[PDB]
Design a protein around this ligand. Structure first.
Ligand SMILES: NC(=O)c1cccnc1
Length: 146
């Protein structure tokens, strides 16, 4: 199928929530993701699923795009989730354009045994409201199997 291996999704999130989201991601990046990446930790996997930073957990048809500019220039999201899926662990179905005012997209399902593991939070410019725009980069990883 050769699904796309990088997808983006944006949300408009409040200032206060976004600040807490940054802090939570960076706490996991330094402190939880390491256990998953180095020691293939089941507990660390579970904590990442439960935290669900991206709000993707359980969604079977969340809309995404391969083009980050489409997110920025359609919804002017202040928070953009960049999902790296080299193993095609997501179920990514192309939803083509169908008529006026539409755009191509990928509809995604995040299985319970796939975690979007946070790896970075990066400042990426400003929204049209003058908000700082943040990109949260994740890698999709399979539950460890011992
Ligand atoms: N159609 C959408 O809701 C959407 C949102 C963010 C990124 N890509 C698509």
């Amino acid at each position: 199928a050769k699904p796309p291996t990088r997808l983006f999704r944006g949300l408009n999130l409040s200032e206060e929530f976004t600040k807490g989201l940054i802090d939570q991601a960076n706490a996991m990046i330094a402190n939880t993701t390491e256990r998953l990446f180095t020691d293939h930790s089941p507990e660390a996997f579970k904590q990442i699923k439960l935290n669900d930073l991206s709000k993707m957990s359980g969604r079977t048809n969340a809309s995404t795009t391969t083009e980050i500019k489409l997110v920025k220039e359609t919804w002017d999201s202040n928070v953009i989730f960049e999902m790296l899926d080299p193993d095609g662990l997501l179920h990514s179905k192309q939803v083509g354009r169908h008529g006026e005012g539409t755009a191509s997209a990928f509809s995604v399902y995040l299985p319970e045994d796939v975690a979007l593991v946070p790896v970075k939070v990066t400042l990426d410019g400003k929204t049209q409201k003058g908000e700082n725009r943040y990109v949260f980069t994740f890698v999709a990883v399979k539950s460890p199997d011992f």
